[PDB]
């Protein structure tokens, strides 16, 4: 587990 | 001739039922074969084709309703020290022709007022008797009862028919309000009524 | 066809351990024991749990009583409460609740908290109470005599009723229980079988109007007996 | 205790109360104005007649605990019993 | 149970009869809505009198051909019995034209 | 035990299966009893019978107006077009040929065209075939501009404001604002004679159009007066959507306090009026748990969206658009959830299953693919980089390649290379190369997508930090560039905690690659200093858990629509 | 009083929908294999759904896939028996 | 077992349990315990387990199946032939029991 | 191929 969450799109 | 629809004339089908809610809405005769009459015609009437006069039969009722309450209260007012012992009468020829125009106007209240806002035609003049004549004359009406209804303590009997006509009378005209049974006869009949009592608890 | 006679044997079964006669509880370990040996496990799956309740059985009652005994409050039953719950899957008693029926407030303290005992004892499970088989000594002292009746739940209901005032109208008798009307019929005339209560109305049969009256000059041999 | 109905073609229809209460307009046509008469002008006598033969089914087979059979409503006698049906609010 | 329609010149009569119920007894319940007291008036069946004490299972009223769903129908004399006016035909689809 | 069953649903069962001989004689029946009779006909799996008559307009004008079982009939015309009749292009070819017929004819009929046109459209909107009801409103607007007068007008402008909402619901945004231009001349002609229209919904649909189209500041001025023009005598309908899309570019804007407001009243309004199971509540629903996802309620916007996509699937059937949009809302919303856990196949469940119906029901080239190709590979991603397999690893992050370049395409396709989405996109596929192994590009995509982001949201949104916080871990973790990656985690927790507070749950990811930079420099102090505060943030999270229901934290009348629009107002 | 009660777990379903078998008896793995080993450890695990299922046959469901049977929500354990 | 993978290997046994479990369950209810059909999901399901590397119950899936397969079908029969046959295969291969 | 093969089908 690296990266956050991403974007809302 | 059959029950299908058809182009019906809807001005003088309506005319023929003026007449018969007239003497509904006052408790006339009403004749039995007048009334399937009427029924078959309120049928024609909502099923008619290439447009369905319901919305032109609900408006016309309402009319109806409105200037004929607006006529009972002008019969109200004229009434000076007498608003009482003709209301408890009038409000029962009144809720008893609700009742025969719920009759009257079922298929009208189970097809196309369901269907839609708009109320049922038999709740319509309750609420209508409310929104007309007794929001003008909701004081009028009970400080004759309440400084009648006070004395019976002190040894002045009231009129039990009278007094007793009323208690259910803002009951019965938000009986089509479920989430709302009993909470306008509260606060417009106990509010003035606890204030008044409470005066007489401790003396 | 041995599923038929597992019916009649469960059926059956279910009668002898509830009403607490059997030859001896090993006896019955070995009898069901040895129908696994001939038909399989799976034969004896549910007959395995009409055993090994009564087992447990002892084994909270006296876990319900520690219960009630180390409580912040102190609560007496006034009855020896004895309880034993059934698994509802395996005994065959489905018959239909809908016959609805509320104990009155004597006995109304005592089943209420061994809910409370169930709810946090064990989780999840419910309790469906089975009010045709719960049998309970009852003080049958209005009389001078102090005799003893085995009741039901049901047929101390209607006496019940009547402990308070000796003369209750089956008017007041056939609310106060709120249970069926057909089956009340033979609940009150097994009380006449062994003459509990004198027929106070005049009819011959009984109906809504069959107004009773307590029996003052009950007598019987045997102080302690079973009412059929 | 007992209603008649007469139709289109005046044909008379007796029934009982409560096996014609269990209609929708029927109990308009009872409740309002007070053996009592039910003029009809646009249902026809076999439609009435299976409307009065529906009535009998469903007050004798209501809350029946076995298998209730279907109402049998003929093909061509359909679409005028099925306006009847709704006109009749059952 | 069976369940009939006792008919006459015009009119239509829906009853319950049990099987067990006589001729007589449907008179009676006739007369209570009908009047027309039972020596006057004589129920038929297609052209067939029934007795007076005579137990309905005889007549041919069998709970399979009086059931509510198409009840029998049996004449009222004082036959005369007008029909229901049928529907219209239905085309018979495969008919061709 | 057994009911019976009444003389009406009996005769309905006999003209059915009298249904040849008398096809004809069914359409002479009252509308309450036809449209019985065809929903008997979708009952007994007869759907090519019923396809033979739904496709006609004048049956179809009389079955649309059963309002009151209107549920049932999404569930019928869409049986249909699953089962292969385009009852929806058919309807509106047929309209179609209905007024290019009366368009020479009085304007008494014209009237009529168009109320059979407002209902189709809005049942076709409603369904979410909006390509098939563009044609039924294009052609409503060529009756109504054929004729210059005050209803003809009031028509127009109305019939422009229903074609606005199905352009955007198609992705057809550059022509929305054509629409728009049309209905400010028409309203603009109105206003010159006196008479005025009430501009909320107008107003309002624009709020919806550049939010799509990522206009966020425009979208957010147009919201602010478009809600101030809403009036007490709107209907339900047009105060729902206003409140709708003002929350959701209220969201965007970070001004949480008030889109908090519009929403819960929105959803309140829509659940007190519509109903729990009504496919506008869904929409609300939608967006609320939209909302719900960007405030940090994420275990809170699951249940949202699973509430709002039970109701669009027991209305709108199997293969719909708008069950197409909840299953790649919830499969993102699901995607965010797991996160942390890992459990990544409920989230792409509803991810095929949404790429599986736009497919079926959209054209190769559309933009509702690119939301859901995007969506489908973020979880193709996750699933990679927790299996311990390699060999299918490398398959999933080529699928998700693929997937992330088509929807790249899409986007530059409809907006450019200048456009937020396409920020976002650039952000999704270096996210992914990150984890295929090609820094040598991932951060020139990386670098563009925080330079297109900052230039046009600004430095004080949250894309701004996911972006940062993206980089910054690719620095951290692979590129070792330990010494530009501490500003960019200090800029991240800076912004996340002044929008979404010291709890936001985002903090995390940017605390273990912090703590991990920290071990891998040689100082030790900040590593127990911020093994502290992720301490102190771990037993915030778990004590800040109320874990409640909005369907239930929205109450029964919180404040009349006159309350909240006055709130709005003043508090901007 | 010597009373009796039929103890019964508070589902409604009635059915358990991994094994449909009757949620009361044993789970079918239960039944199988540990039916004459040792059969008292088939306990039944609600959800947040509210759905129920017998112990072993929602553990075993959970090796595959994380969702709950019945509807394709995701499955977190309610309430146990013990 | 042909495949490589621990976590394939793991689901693929774990799906061909649950088939073989609805199987028996549904033979269960339709026949009864003592048949021919469930006697072959039992095998079926023993030789699972020794797939499974479960092989304590295995060898009790496997006399389940064998002692209702040769109590209907005799001593001498196909299915008994092959029932034994895999908990032979269960005992000298991997419970040691030689 | 450690096993025989299935009973049936
Ligand atoms: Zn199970
Ligand atoms: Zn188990
Ligand atoms: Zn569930």
């Known amino acids: 587990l690296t990266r956050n969450k991403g974007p809302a799109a | 001739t059959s029950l299908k629809p058809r182009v019906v004339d809807f001005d003088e089908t309506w005319n023929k039922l003026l007449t018969t809610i007239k003497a509904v809405v006052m408790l006339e005769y009403v004749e039995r074969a007048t009334w399937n009459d009427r029924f078959s015609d309120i049928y024609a009437l909502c099923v008619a084709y290439p447009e369905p006069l319901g919305e032109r039969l609900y408006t016309e009722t309402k009319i109806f309703l409105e200037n004929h309450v607006r006529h009972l209260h002008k019969r109200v007012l004229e009434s000076e020290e007498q608003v009482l012992v003709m209301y408890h009468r009038y409000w029962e020829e009144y809720s008893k022709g609700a009742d025969y125009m719920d009759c009257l106007y079922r298929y009208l209240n189970t097809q196309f007022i369901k269907k839609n806002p708009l109320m049922e035609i038999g709740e319509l003049a309750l609420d209508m008797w409310r929104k007309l004549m007794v929001e003008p004359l909701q004081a009028i009406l009970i400080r004759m009862l309440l400084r009648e209804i006070k004395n019976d303590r002190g040894g002045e009997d009231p009129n039990q028919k009278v007094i007793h006509g009323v208690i259910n009378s803002f009951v019965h005209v938000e009986q089509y309000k479920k989430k709302f049974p009993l909470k306008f006869y509260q606060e417009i009949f106990e509010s003035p009524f606890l204030t008044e009592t409470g005066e007489y608890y401790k003396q | 066809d041995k599923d038929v006679f597992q019916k009649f044997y469960a059926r059956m079964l279910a009668k002898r351990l509830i009403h607490g006669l059997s030859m001896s509880m090993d006896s019955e370990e070995a009898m069901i024991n040895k129908l696994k040996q001939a038909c399989g496990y799976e034969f004896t799956s549910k007959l395995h749990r009409m055993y090994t309740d009564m087992s447990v059985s002892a084994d909270l009652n006296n876990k319900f009583n520690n219960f009630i005994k180390n409580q912040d409050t102190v609560i007496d039953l006034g009855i020896s409460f004895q309880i034993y719950v059934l698994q509802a899957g395996a005994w065959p008693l489905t018959q239909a609740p809908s016959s609805t029926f509320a104990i009155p407030q004597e006995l109304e303290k005592s089943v209420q908290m061994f809910e409370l005992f169930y709810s946090q004892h064990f989780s999840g499970r419910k309790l469906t109470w089975l009010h045709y088989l719960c049998t309970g000594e009852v003080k049958m002292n209005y009389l001078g005599k102090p005799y003893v009746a085995m009741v039901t739940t049901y047929q101390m209901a209607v006496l019940l009723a009547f402990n308070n005032s000796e003369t209750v109208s089956y008017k007041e008798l056939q609310d106060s229980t709120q249970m069926n009307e057909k089956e009340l019929t033979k609940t009150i005339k097994s009380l006449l079988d062994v003459k509990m209560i004198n027929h106070d109305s005049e009819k011959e049969d009984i109906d809504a109007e069959s107004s009773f009256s307590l029996n003052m000059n009950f007598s019987s041999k045997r102080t302690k007996f079973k009412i059929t | 205790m007992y209603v008649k109905l007469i139709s289109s073609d005046g044909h008379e229809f007796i029934v009982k109360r409560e096996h014609a209460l269990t209609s929708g307009t029927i109990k308009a046509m009872l409740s309002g104005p007070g053996t009592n008469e039910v003029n009809f002008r646009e249902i026809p006598s076999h439609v009435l007649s299976k409307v009065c033969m529906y009535f009998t089914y469903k007050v004798r087979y209501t809350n029946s605990s076995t298998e209730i059979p279907e109402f049998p409503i003929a093909p061509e006698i359909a679409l005028e019993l099925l306006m009847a049906a709704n006109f009749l609010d059952c | ?97 | 035990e057994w009911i019976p069953e009444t003389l009406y649903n009996t005769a309905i069962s006999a003209v059915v299966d009298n249904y040849i001989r008398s096809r004809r004689d069914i359409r002479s029946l009252p509308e309450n009893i036809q449209f019985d009779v065809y929903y008997k006909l979708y009952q007994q799996g007869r759907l090519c019978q019923l396809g033979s008559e739904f496709c006609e307009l004048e049956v179809f004008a009389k079955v649309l107006r059963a309002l009151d079982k209107r549920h049932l009939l999404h569930h019928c015309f869409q049986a249909l077009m699953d089962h292969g009749v385009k009852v929806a292009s058919v309807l509106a070819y047929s309209f179609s040929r209905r007024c290019s017929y009366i368009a020479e004819s009085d304007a008494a009929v014209k009237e009529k065209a168009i109320q059979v046109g407002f209902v189709l459209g809005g049942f076709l909107s409603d369904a979410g075939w909006y390509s098939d009801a563009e044609k039924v409103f294009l052609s409503c607007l060529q009756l109504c501009t054929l004729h210059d007068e005050m209803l003809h007008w009031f028509r127009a402008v109305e019939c422009c404001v229903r074609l606005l909402h199905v352009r955007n619901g198609n992705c057809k945004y550059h022509l929305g604002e054509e629409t728009f231009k049309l209905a400010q001349t028409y309203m603009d002609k109105l206003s010159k004679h006196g008479q005025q229209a009430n501009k909320a919904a107008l107003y309002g649909e624009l709020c919806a159009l550049l939010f799509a189209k990522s206009h966020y500041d425009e979208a957010y001025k147009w919201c602010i007066e478009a809600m101030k023009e809403i009036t007490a005598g709107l209907p339900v309908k047009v105060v729902v959507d206003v409140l709708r899309q003002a929350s959701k570019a209220c969201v965007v804007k970070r001004e949480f306090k008030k889109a908090e407001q519009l929403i819960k009243h929105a959803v309140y309004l829509a659940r007190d009026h519509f109903g729990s199971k009504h496919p506008k509540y869904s929409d609300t629903l939608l967006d609320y748990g939209f909302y719900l996802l960007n405030v940090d309620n994420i275990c809170q916007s699951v249940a949202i969206y699973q509430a709002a996509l039970d109701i669009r699937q027991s209305v709108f059937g199997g293969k719909n658009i708008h069950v197409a949009t909840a299953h790649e809302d919830l499969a993102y919303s699901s995607y965010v959830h797991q996160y942390s856990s890992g459990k990544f196949d409920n989230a792409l469940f509803h991810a095929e299953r949404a790429i599986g119906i736009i497919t079926h029901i959209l054209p190769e080239d559309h933009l509702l693919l690119a939301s859901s190709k995007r969506v489908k590979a973020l979880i193709l991603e996750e699933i990679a980089i927790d299996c311990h397999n390699k060999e299918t690893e490398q398959r999933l992050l080529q699928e998700a390649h693929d997937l992330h370049l088509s929807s790249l395409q899409l986007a530059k396709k409809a907006f450019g290379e200048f456009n937020v989405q396409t920020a976002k996109h650039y952000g999704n596929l270096g996210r992914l190369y990150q984890s295929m192994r090609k820094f040598k590009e991932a951060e020139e995509m990386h670098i563009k997508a925080i330079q297109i982001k900052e230039q046009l949201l600004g430095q004080e949104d949250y894309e701004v930090a996911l972006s940062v916080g993206h980089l910054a871990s690719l620095y951290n973790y692979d590129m070792n560039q330990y010494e530009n990656a501490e500003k960019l985690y200090l800029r991240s927790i800076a912004i996340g905690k002044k929008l979404f507070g010291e709890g936001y749950s985002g903090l995390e990811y940017d605390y273990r690659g912090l703590i991990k930079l920290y071990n891998s420099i040689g100082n030790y102090e900040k590593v127990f200093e911020y093994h502290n505060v992720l301490s102190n943030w771990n037993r915030l999270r778990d004590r800040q858990y109320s874990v409640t229901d909005a369907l239930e934290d929205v109450s029964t009348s919180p404040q009349s629509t006159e309350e909240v629009v006055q709130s709005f107002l003043i508090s901007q | 009083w010597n009373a009796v009660a039929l103890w019964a777990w508070d589902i409604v379903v009635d059915n358990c929908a991994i094994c449909r078998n009757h949620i009361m008896d044993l789970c079918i793995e239960c039944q199988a294999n540990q039916a004459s080993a040792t059969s008292e450890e088939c306990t039944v695990a609600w959800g947040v759904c509210n759905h129920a299922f017998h112990f072993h046959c929602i553990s075993r469901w959970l090796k595959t896939r994380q969702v709950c049977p019945l509807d394709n929500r995701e499955w977190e354990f309610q309430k146990y028996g013990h």
């Open chain 5, 1 to 97: 149970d069976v369940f009939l329609m006792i008919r006459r010149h015009k009119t239509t009569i829906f009853t319950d009869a049990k099987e067990s119920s006589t001729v007589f007894e449907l008179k009676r319940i006739v007369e209570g809505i009908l009047k027309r007291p039972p020596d006057e008036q004589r129920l038929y069946k297609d052209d067939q009198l029934l007795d007076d004490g005579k137990t309905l299972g005889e007549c041919g009223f069998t709970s399979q051909t009086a059931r509510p769903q198409a009840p029998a129908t049996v004449g009222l004399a004082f036959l005369c019995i007008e029909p229901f006016s049928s529907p219209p035909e239905l085309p018979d689809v495969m008919k061709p034209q």
